CSV table of C-alpha atoms and ligand atoms in Angstrom, one decimal:
chain,number,residue,atom,x,y,z
A,6,UNK,CA,102.1,172.2,147.0
A,7,UNK,CA,105.7,174.0,148.3
A,8,UNK,CA,105.4,176.3,150.6
A,9,UNK,CA,108.7,178.3,149.1
A,10,UNK,CA,107.8,178.5,145.6
A,11,UNK,CA,107.5,182.6,145.0
A,12,UNK,CA,106.2,184.4,142.4
A,13,UNK,CA,105.1,183.7,137.9
A,14,UNK,CA,106.5,181.0,136.6
A,15,UNK,CA,110.3,181.3,135.4
A,16,UNK,CA,111.5,181.6,131.9
A,17,UNK,CA,115.2,181.4,129.6
A,18,UNK,CA,113.4,185.7,129.6
A,19,UNK,CA,112.6,186.2,132.8
A,20,UNK,CA,115.7,184.5,134.5
A,21,UNK,CA,118.3,187.1,131.7
A,22,UNK,CA,116.9,189.5,132.7
A,23,UNK,CA,118.0,192.4,134.5
A,24,UNK,CA,115.5,192.9,136.9
A,25,UNK,CA,113.4,189.3,138.4
A,26,UNK,CA,109.2,190.5,140.2
A,27,UNK,CA,110.2,191.3,142.6
A,28,UNK,CA,110.3,195.8,143.8
A,29,UNK,CA,113.6,195.7,145.7
A,30,UNK,CA,115.1,198.1,148.8
A,31,UNK,CA,117.6,198.2,150.6
A,32,UNK,CA,119.8,199.6,153.5
A,33,UNK,CA,122.6,199.9,155.0
A,34,UNK,CA,123.1,197.8,158.8
A,35,UNK,CA,124.4,199.8,161.3
A,36,UNK,CA,125.4,198.0,163.5
A,37,UNK,CA,127.6,195.3,161.9
A,38,UNK,CA,128.0,192.7,164.6
A,39,UNK,CA,131.2,190.9,163.3
A,40,UNK,CA,132.0,191.8,160.3
A,41,UNK,CA,133.3,195.2,158.8
A,42,UNK,CA,130.6,197.6,156.9
A,43,UNK,CA,126.7,195.3,155.1
A,44,UNK,CA,123.9,196.2,153.1
A,45,UNK,CA,120.7,194.4,152.6
A,46,UNK,CA,118.8,193.8,150.1
A,47,UNK,CA,114.9,192.4,150.0
A,48,UNK,CA,111.8,192.3,148.3
A,49,UNK,CA,109.2,194.1,149.2
A,50,UNK,CA,106.2,192.0,147.7
A,51,UNK,CA,107.0,188.9,147.6
A,52,UNK,CA,104.1,187.0,149.1
A,53,UNK,CA,105.9,185.3,151.4
A,54,UNK,CA,108.6,184.6,153.4
A,55,UNK,CA,112.0,184.2,151.7
A,56,UNK,CA,115.5,182.5,152.3
A,57,UNK,CA,119.1,184.6,153.0
A,58,UNK,CA,121.8,184.6,150.9
A,59,UNK,CA,125.2,186.2,152.6
A,60,UNK,CA,128.1,187.3,150.0
A,61,UNK,CA,131.1,188.4,150.0
A,62,UNK,CA,134.3,189.7,148.6
A,63,UNK,CA,137.5,188.9,147.9
A,64,UNK,CA,141.6,189.7,148.8
A,65,UNK,CA,141.7,193.8,148.3
A,66,UNK,CA,138.0,193.5,147.3
A,67,UNK,CA,134.6,195.6,148.7
A,68,UNK,CA,130.9,194.5,148.0
A,69,UNK,CA,131.0,196.9,145.1
A,70,UNK,CA,132.6,194.0,143.4
A,71,UNK,CA,129.5,192.0,144.4
A,72,UNK,CA,127.4,194.5,144.8
A,73,UNK,CA,125.3,193.0,141.7
A,74,UNK,CA,123.5,189.9,142.6
A,75,UNK,CA,122.5,191.6,145.6
A,76,UNK,CA,119.1,193.6,143.3
A,77,UNK,CA,119.4,189.9,141.1
A,78,UNK,CA,119.2,188.0,143.6
A,79,UNK,CA,116.4,189.9,145.5
A,80,UNK,CA,113.9,190.4,142.7
A,81,UNK,CA,113.9,187.1,142.7
A,82,UNK,CA,112.8,186.4,146.2
A,83,UNK,CA,115.7,186.9,149.1
A,84,UNK,CA,116.6,189.0,151.7
A,85,UNK,CA,120.8,189.0,150.2
A,86,UNK,CA,123.7,190.3,152.0
A,87,UNK,CA,126.7,192.4,150.7
A,88,UNK,CA,129.6,192.2,153.4
A,89,UNK,CA,132.5,194.3,154.0
A,90,UNK,CA,134.9,192.1,155.5
A,91,UNK,CA,136.9,193.8,159.2
A,92,UNK,CA,139.8,194.0,157.2
A,93,UNK,CA,139.9,193.7,153.2
A,94,UNK,CA,142.9,191.4,153.8
A,95,UNK,CA,141.6,189.0,156.0
A,96,UNK,CA,141.7,184.9,154.5
A,97,UNK,CA,139.1,182.5,153.9
A,98,UNK,CA,138.2,181.3,157.2
A,99,UNK,CA,137.5,185.0,158.9
A,100,UNK,CA,135.4,185.3,156.0
A,101,UNK,CA,133.6,182.1,156.5
A,102,UNK,CA,133.5,183.1,159.8
A,103,UNK,CA,132.3,186.8,158.7
A,104,UNK,CA,129.8,186.3,155.7
A,105,UNK,CA,128.2,183.1,158.8
A,106,UNK,CA,128.0,186.2,161.4
A,107,UNK,CA,126.0,188.0,158.2
A,108,UNK,CA,123.6,185.9,158.6
A,109,UNK,CA,123.3,185.3,161.8
A,110,UNK,CA,122.5,189.5,161.9
A,111,UNK,CA,119.8,188.0,159.1
A,112,UNK,CA,118.5,186.4,161.9
A,113,UNK,CA,117.8,189.2,164.0
A,114,UNK,CA,116.7,191.6,161.9
A,115,UNK,CA,114.2,189.4,160.5
A,116,UNK,CA,113.4,189.6,164.4
A,117,UNK,CA,113.7,194.0,165.0
A,118,UNK,CA,110.4,195.2,165.1
A,119,UNK,CA,112.2,198.4,163.7
A,120,UNK,CA,113.7,196.3,160.4
A,121,UNK,CA,112.4,196.4,157.2
A,122,UNK,CA,112.6,192.9,156.6
A,123,UNK,CA,110.8,191.9,160.4
A,124,UNK,CA,108.7,189.0,158.7
A,125,UNK,CA,110.4,188.8,156.0
A,126,UNK,CA,112.9,185.8,156.8
A,127,UNK,CA,112.7,182.3,156.6
A,128,UNK,CA,115.8,181.7,159.0
A,129,UNK,CA,116.0,177.6,158.3
A,130,UNK,CA,116.4,178.8,155.2
A,131,UNK,CA,120.2,180.2,154.3
A,132,UNK,CA,122.7,180.1,150.9
A,133,UNK,CA,126.6,181.5,150.8
A,134,UNK,CA,127.9,183.4,147.7
A,135,UNK,CA,131.2,184.8,147.2
A,136,UNK,CA,134.8,186.2,145.8
A,137,UNK,CA,137.4,185.0,145.6
A,138,UNK,CA,139.1,184.3,148.7
A,139,UNK,CA,135.1,184.9,149.8
A,140,UNK,CA,134.1,182.1,147.0
A,141,UNK,CA,136.6,179.5,148.9
A,142,UNK,CA,135.2,180.7,152.3
A,143,UNK,CA,131.6,180.1,151.4
A,144,UNK,CA,132.8,177.2,150.9
A,145,UNK,CA,134.4,176.7,154.3
A,146,UNK,CA,130.6,177.7,155.2
A,147,UNK,CA,128.8,175.5,153.9
A,148,UNK,CA,131.9,172.3,155.2
A,149,UNK,CA,130.5,174.1,158.8
A,150,UNK,CA,127.1,174.1,158.3
A,151,UNK,CA,125.2,171.9,156.4
A,152,UNK,CA,122.0,172.7,157.0
A,153,UNK,CA,122.8,175.6,154.8
A,154,UNK,CA,121.3,175.4,151.3
A,155,UNK,CA,123.5,176.1,148.5
A,156,UNK,CA,126.3,177.3,148.7
A,157,UNK,CA,127.3,180.0,145.3
A,158,UNK,CA,130.6,181.5,144.8
A,159,UNK,CA,132.8,182.4,142.1
A,160,UNK,CA,136.5,182.7,141.3
A,161,UNK,CA,136.6,180.4,144.2
A,162,UNK,CA,140.2,179.8,146.5
A,163,UNK,CA,141.0,178.2,149.8
A,164,UNK,CA,144.8,176.9,150.5
A,165,UNK,CA,143.3,173.5,150.5
A,166,UNK,CA,141.3,173.1,147.7
A,167,UNK,CA,139.5,169.7,149.6
A,168,UNK,CA,136.5,169.7,150.1
A,169,UNK,CA,135.1,166.4,150.3
A,170,UNK,CA,132.6,166.6,153.3
A,171,UNK,CA,130.7,169.1,151.8
A,172,UNK,CA,127.1,167.9,151.6
A,173,UNK,CA,125.6,171.6,149.8
A,174,UNK,CA,124.8,172.0,146.4
A,175,UNK,CA,127.2,174.3,145.6
A,176,UNK,CA,128.0,176.2,141.8
A,177,UNK,CA,131.1,176.8,141.4
A,178,UNK,CA,131.4,179.5,138.6
A,179,UNK,CA,134.7,180.2,136.7
A,180,UNK,CA,136.3,182.2,134.5
A,181,UNK,CA,138.6,180.8,132.1
A,182,UNK,CA,141.9,182.6,131.9
A,183,UNK,CA,141.5,183.7,135.1
A,184,UNK,CA,145.0,183.8,136.6
A,185,UNK,CA,145.7,185.2,140.0
A,186,UNK,CA,143.8,182.2,141.2
A,187,UNK,CA,143.3,179.7,137.9
A,188,UNK,CA,140.8,176.9,137.5
A,189,UNK,CA,143.2,174.3,137.1
A,190,UNK,CA,145.3,174.8,140.7
A,191,UNK,CA,142.0,175.8,142.7
A,192,UNK,CA,138.3,176.2,140.6
A,193,UNK,CA,138.6,172.8,139.3
A,194,UNK,CA,140.7,170.5,141.7
A,195,UNK,CA,137.4,172.2,144.4
A,196,UNK,CA,134.6,171.0,142.2
A,197,UNK,CA,136.5,167.5,142.3
A,198,UNK,CA,136.8,166.5,146.1
A,199,UNK,CA,132.8,166.8,145.7
A,200,UNK,CA,131.4,163.6,146.2
A,201,UNK,CA,129.0,164.2,147.6
A,202,UNK,CA,126.5,167.2,146.8
A,203,UNK,CA,124.1,167.8,143.4
A,204,UNK,CA,127.3,170.3,141.9
A,205,UNK,CA,127.6,172.1,139.5
A,206,UNK,CA,130.7,173.8,137.1
A,207,UNK,CA,129.9,176.5,135.3
A,208,UNK,CA,133.5,178.2,133.3
A,209,UNK,CA,133.8,181.6,131.7
A,210,UNK,CA,134.9,181.8,128.3
A,211,UNK,CA,138.1,183.4,128.1
A,212,UNK,CA,136.6,185.3,131.4
A,213,UNK,CA,139.6,186.9,134.3
A,214,UNK,CA,139.3,186.6,137.6
A,215,UNK,CA,136.8,189.3,138.0
A,216,UNK,CA,134.6,187.5,135.1
A,217,UNK,CA,131.2,187.7,137.2
A,218,UNK,CA,131.2,190.6,139.8
A,219,UNK,CA,130.8,193.6,138.7
A,220,UNK,CA,130.1,194.7,135.6
A,221,UNK,CA,130.4,192.1,133.8
A,222,UNK,CA,129.5,191.4,130.5
A,223,UNK,CA,127.5,188.0,131.1
A,224,UNK,CA,124.7,188.9,133.5
A,225,UNK,CA,122.2,187.1,131.7
A,226,UNK,CA,123.6,184.0,131.6
A,227,UNK,CA,125.4,184.3,135.2
A,228,UNK,CA,122.6,185.9,136.6
A,229,UNK,CA,120.0,183.3,135.3
A,230,UNK,CA,122.2,180.1,136.4
A,231,UNK,CA,123.0,181.7,139.8
A,232,UNK,CA,119.0,182.8,141.0
A,233,UNK,CA,118.3,179.2,139.4
A,234,UNK,CA,120.2,177.3,141.7
A,235,UNK,CA,119.2,179.4,144.5
A,236,UNK,CA,115.8,178.9,143.9
A,237,UNK,CA,116.1,175.5,142.8
A,238,UNK,CA,118.2,174.5,146.4
A,239,UNK,CA,117.1,177.0,149.1
A,240,UNK,CA,112.9,176.9,147.4
A,241,UNK,CA,113.6,172.9,146.7
A,242,UNK,CA,111.7,174.7,143.9
A,243,UNK,CA,111.1,172.1,141.2
A,244,UNK,CA,110.3,175.0,138.3
A,245,UNK,CA,113.6,175.5,138.2
A,246,UNK,CA,115.3,172.5,137.8
A,247,UNK,CA,115.7,172.8,134.5
A,248,UNK,CA,117.2,175.5,134.0
A,249,UNK,CA,119.6,175.0,137.5
A,250,UNK,CA,120.9,172.0,135.9
A,251,UNK,CA,120.5,172.6,132.1
A,252,UNK,CA,124.3,172.7,130.5
A,253,UNK,CA,123.4,176.5,128.6
A,254,UNK,CA,125.3,175.1,125.2
A,255,UNK,CA,126.4,179.3,125.1
A,256,UNK,CA,129.5,180.6,123.4
A,257,UNK,CA,129.8,182.2,127.0
A,258,UNK,CA,130.8,178.8,128.3
A,259,UNK,CA,134.2,177.2,127.9
A,260,UNK,CA,133.3,174.3,130.5
A,261,UNK,CA,129.8,173.3,131.5
A,262,UNK,CA,129.5,170.2,133.8
A,263,UNK,CA,127.8,168.8,136.7
A,264,UNK,CA,126.7,165.9,139.5
A,265,UNK,CA,124.0,164.7,141.0
A,266,UNK,CA,121.6,167.4,140.0
A,267,UNK,CA,118.5,165.9,138.4
A,268,UNK,CA,115.6,163.9,139.4
A,269,UNK,CA,115.4,160.3,138.8
A,270,UNK,CA,112.6,158.3,140.0
B,24,CL,CL1,142.7,187.1,135.9
B,25,NA,NA1,131.3,194.4,164.7
């Protein structure tokens, strides 16, 4: 029935695993348009067109900090682009423009016969993710582009915490012990500002600012949640509603909040 549903019915184990059902390949963007550099991860055997997600790092950071998401998401049926910004010192508004530029390029590559992703993307179904300033940029992207299907920033920061205009379903990963972008002044005020969307707050117990980055020790949970969120909202895949909306009730989570996530008859 759902034309966007891909892959086998999910389980907790399947979502917690390092890899999803699909085989993944990647390429580096040869001529980046509007951003510094990019790597595109894609499924080779999805069975249908899939949505696209663009991920941006934090200040001073590069693709390495967020690269784990690429294969993790692509393996579940997404085309994911991780970027390096024009400057490592770019601010959130710039990061947002660059993130959108990356999504635009994925759309262009979907239409380029020589590309590995030719015809593999449903350009009408897109998502945004990012770390810190990149997370704030993801939120800026969502505010400015309400046709985006999902947002899942991690340890987000922006100069303004008021994201009241966001109508995109948004999952905020936070880190309890963050000293760069403290939860109390950053992630949580941002979460609280949003009253018009499906939203979720997931704080990792004892986490530093890099708690959701490559090499984190909570990939099973974090990966499960991120994929579930994207599946539920990018693909409208209600097979993932419990996973997306549930409170994990895990020692790894120190603070869980959610609103407007579950469907009511
Ligand atoms: Cl920290
Ligand atoms: Na460029």
